[model samples]
Target: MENFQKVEKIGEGTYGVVYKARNKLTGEVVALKKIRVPSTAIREISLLKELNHPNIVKLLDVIHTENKLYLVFEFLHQDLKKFMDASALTGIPLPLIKSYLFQLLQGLAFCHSHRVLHRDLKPQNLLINTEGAIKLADFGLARAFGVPVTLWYRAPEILLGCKYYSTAVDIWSLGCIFAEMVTRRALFPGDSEIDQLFRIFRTLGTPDEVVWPGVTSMPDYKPSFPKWARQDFSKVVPPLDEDGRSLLSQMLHYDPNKRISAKAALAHPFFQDVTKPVPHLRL
Candidate 1:
């Protein structure tokens, strides 16, 4: 507290309030996140300490006292959600969209390479700087292994109560966010668990043994589920180019095993025209 000056209250996260601060020693701006006792503090701390990348928020240090835990992070301005809102009317530029999604995939590629899974990835969790840099943030719900995910972005395999989920789950969410970035709206804004699944089915079509082999054997499988024809990506994400749509199609695949990996996605033709340097290529 003595070394940092709190500028103001930013907002509350799942566990505590986050603040924008300035380091008194070097005048460096940073974000100080407060974590409550017995929360997912340890998980967030340990995971972030091991992840270091240009597209990922850096964890500078952690402070622990009798009753409080403060996490120091590199400062970022608005999140992807705010940027989307600001550009809702005009929609994001194609090159900018490609660049942002490329950076996102870069960060995810790094995490997945390290066997880490960001169970929760949405527009609100992606931070954007004034330089047009996109960084992944918020690790409270992140994990390195099998774990539950949020409803809208969750994969169908997880919805079927499959315990042995994989990195494809994150790619599914990335697909949803990429669609949102193009349309300036949620691709599937479902209100409930069933509603969410239905929304996904309505867009990507319901899976069966043909598309998703052994779909009926999952613990939560239902025989009476409605069959849906896959919708056209052009109709859903109209502004996206051909390569972008193709990449997104692979990402939102119904079968987890069929979804494209983050590392592979970086090499997709969709990103070939992007001027930003891809870290994954170097890695």
Candidate 2:
């Protein structure tokens, strides 16, 4: 059952490149997470049960390779990144967008309930199937509670080097992804960590101790930084309507305490139209 033959390279992660694989016995197609090191795989293995959700990628098997480990996962069609890149002509429709974002929030809700923080949530990490369902993938940065965090999805607290962050950190990533899904472009494509913080500040406005309690004491906080005014974010994601914009603003709040949690987000007005539930994963 553990024997899987490597098919073709699918994509790369922070740790390693994933490949399409096929089971030697049943001929079942799967994904092989070929990452080196022992600890990450072992940690992922123990955390597997907690991450079980319809929207989260399924970890089916783990094969020992002595030095490195291969994690077998349920193979999906393509990632959100590929989907968006190819949809430039057709444009991401409103209904599918609603479905994807709702599924994403559901996955996050499940993870937060179990104290799992998916530090990674970019387009490339949100894999989609032909059925319009999205499965959260590439948990190389999956944290039990809580990482070179993804810059585009990076939270301001992470940029400020806050060690004691909570599930709200992942909420920031979700927010960034929401806008990107609508715009088909990264909202904040920072070249460096400092630039990342500046991108966040430019949109959310430069936060002071007043806006974010104890923000001044952050390791990276400096008064010398530019005090950018909050621009109307509605202009950036012009295609998004009122309910979508309102939901995004709450998710992108500068103060982690003010940010909307995944559980509450699923109940937000923007998703009210998403009456039909995403079906459970099927073979």
Candidate 3:
């Protein structure tokens, strides 16, 4: 605490209080995020934070004291918004979209492989370094994949790299990011869950029990929900081709069980022409 000096408040998010800080010893600028916990019962509860993927934000260190859990992270130059904004000038070059989207899927593949879900993926949550390294950030809504998780099925499945393939919610997030990258705006900019579903339903049309299998079982599902026809993706993303359109639809598929896996998306035909090397996957 004595060595790190607070330079300025960068963000006071719903999850934590963030600031720009500097280390007295090395003079390196870093982001310091302060999260408040229960002051009454203080205990160090450790779950495996073994996230070391290059495309995911690095948690450098932690300072636990007085109900304030401070997380230290490497400072990023910008976020996906930068390139998205750059796209507005004349639209993001297809190559750049392929490059960034590939990185997004790669990071996602690594996370899903280990059963982690980055639930709140968006432009700002994706941080970019000077070298254009895209790292997933802000894990406020991130969680360990455990839902629909059978008990005895755990041990046996994990031995052979886990066949559980929990059809990721993060893929939906990737879909939104994918659409945003192409159109320079959010595809379904909803304010709440209901609104969000409504937006999705309007675009993809209302799904029936046959469509999603478990659509009615969803807590938010209502029979009275309005129905609409699916929108033409080519019209929405005029510049995107048939291959690109195929990938986007897979990501946005209404059935969570049938959604495209990150690994599968990477192998999609859309990227066959994107023969460029990813930004070293390092800062």
Candidate 4:
């Protein structure tokens, strides 16, 4: 808590600047996330209090200052995005992807069980510890999701504009994250919000009213995705096998109703049939 000595800013996060600091008493390292109060402090505090899992970043302590609120999180050196970049530049192995994905699913399963939805599920939000364990971090964009759009993780039902949704949205994003993990790049790296939708349509091949009814009624619903250019999956991410291809197809399902939930995905033949056991660790 108060034992940490201020070091340096690690990075600017959704809430505020995060720092890599050292505990004065134990000399242990910790990440100090400082969020300016009277702003987005309670949203994080309220959410963190509800979320507790080994795979998810743990909140060690909280400090409320007159000008800022400090959140003490377990220090992590880097995130999945940094690793993805390194892997892209250096070529990551299959086992590495499997390890990361396994932990990602485990953490997500925990969140889903608690009735929490992490709206922004991407590599950038996934943190890697010293021992190479992946922990889900940053819940600023997350919400109850009884009905809401996480945007990037938004499922087809959400795109067509659905009033009801569940953990499937996160699953869809998991698919995107899976693909990004394998290819070491973003699957649907849309230029803009509208463009993001169009990029999704290109790969998943748009939605039909028959498949998702009343999609046009949503406030931002676009009946027709104009300027949407179809894309080739083979070209987008080459060398994906039958299992990888199949899993991607299942995750990118247009209907949130039809999309594979985390529990179902664990049962899916793809994960069960993979070469290695799911990687899970405790710190």
Candidate 5:
């Protein structure tokens, strides 16, 4: 575990460097993600150590090379972002997107069950293998929830600034990812953090300060949406299809308590066509 064969530098992660490597002992392909200690690395490694689910990228071994922490995962071929844009992939088929997303939810559900919240749930963090199986990767920004505002794909309550939030935060992110996969573009492509908030407000309509009590107390809270500027969904996510738009509405429900749970989302009518049979993979 000293030096991981140094196969190839894969990508930059929140914690540190990620590389595709082969374990000298077993000759198995694995992702060697090196993380710096104390803060981001500690939280990430601890959370990943406790997670176990087929759809979640497995943390095989924790290799501590003196001061560095290497998180080991089964090497995945590519990520959702790659499949979505690569000419070789020809864009993922709708059915494929649905299947992969369902697996992603399975992974997220396991994390929630264990009180882990992955703050970052974007496409790049979703990895796919040669067999088309998917795994949720990159836990560097993940917080062991039982806390609040792990806002990568934050629900309105968290976004509205609740001190104690739950697994529903991941659901909100899943909803956003779902929309992006379908449209081949991000649902709320905000120009800035403030711009993102505004985009969310315009589509979903600004939450009434009364509805979201203490909304004004958030560190970044800024209520600029007047009653007239709200209620404009079409103008926000203009290219989404009717069904695609409906699913987004459910996931992005202003009320976190009402947001679709992972279990229920699989049964949703939106997934009826893709859920006729659960997929099976050897890995």
Candidate 6:
């Protein structure tokens, strides 16, 4: 506590207020998240300690006091939400978008490989630096293996009350974010759970046994929603090229089993340019 000087309150989160701070000793800037409760503190602390990847937010240190649990993290420029807000009028550049999305999938692939599921993944949870590097943040809702997720990003199976789900739920969230990045707007900006499902169907079309086998067998599964033909994604994400559209489609698949995994997406043609080694390319 005495080693760092609080700069300013950044924002309030599910647990408590986050602050921008400076290490008094090394003079390094960092983010300080205050966790006042026991349960959330335990989850975040334990999960972050076990996770480590280039595109994932780094947990520097943890400080525990009588009434507060303060987490120190490497400072980042801003969240993807801030970048999206700034680019709302003109939209984000194509190369930058690819870089950001590629980095996001890279991070998620690492998380999934380690069997960690990030239950809440949104633009607001992705931190970006001035150098255009993006890192996944906010692990408050993250847990190992299966768990519930936020409405907008929740996979169809989870919405249908599938108790034993998979890591595909995070892929669905990454897909939603990918669409939002291309269009500079949320793909499924629904006001409720049902509305969210409808929003997804409106874009990807209503799923049948052919596309999503065994979908009707889930507990909350309903066949009553008006069937929707898959909308032309080019019209929806006007900025994305054909390969980009293809990658987005696979990520947003209604069947969790059918959805593209983060690792697979990294190999998709849309990311080929970014994934290539710099020295391997001809000058």
Q: lDDT value for candidate 6?
A: 0.79
Name the runs in model 5 displaced over 4 angstroms: 38-47, 87-91, 144-163, 209-219, 223-244, 275-283
Models ranked on TM-score: 2, 1, 6, 3, 4, 5
> What is candidate 6's lDDT per residue for 1-283, written digit by digit as tens?
8888999988887556889999999999999987644566456566667688889898888777776678888888688888788888987777788888898889988878877777778787788776567898865344422232447666787777887888898888888888888888787787888898888788888878988899878887787877999989888888789999899889888888878999899899998787321111111
Better of 2 and 4 by TM-score: 2
Off by more than 4 A, model 3: 38-49, 139-141, 144-167, 275-283
Best by TM-score: 2
The CA root-mean-square deviation of candidate 3, after full C-alpha superposition on the true structure, stands at: 7.4
TM-score for each model? 0.89, 0.91, 0.82, 0.81, 0.81, 0.87
Candidate 1: 10-residue stretch with minimal lDDT: 274-283
lDDT string, candidate 5, 87-106, tens digits: 23344456776777778877
Deviation from native of the Cα of residue 45 in model 4, angstroms: 2.6
Worst 10 residues of 2 by lDDT: 140-149
Candidate 1 local Cα displacement, residue 136, angstroms: 0.6
| Best model per lDDT | 1
TM-score preference between candidates 3 and 4, better one: 3
- Write out the backbone clash pairs for model 6: none
lDDT by residue for model 4 (1-283), tens: 4667888877786556888899898788888876544445455565666577777887777677666577787777777777667666655566666666667777888878877667667777788866657788864333421213425655655555455567777788878888877776677777667767877877766666665565556567765556344466667567776766776777777766777677766666556634443323332
TM-score: model 1 vs. ground truth: 0.89
**lDDT (Cα atoms) of all candidates against the true structure:** 0.80, 0.79, 0.67, 0.68, 0.68, 0.79
Predicted structure 3, TM vs. truth = 0.82
- Cα-based RMSD of the predictions, in order? 4.6, 3.3, 7.4, 4.4, 4.4, 4.7
Candidate 6, residue 1: how far the Cα is off, in Å: 3.5
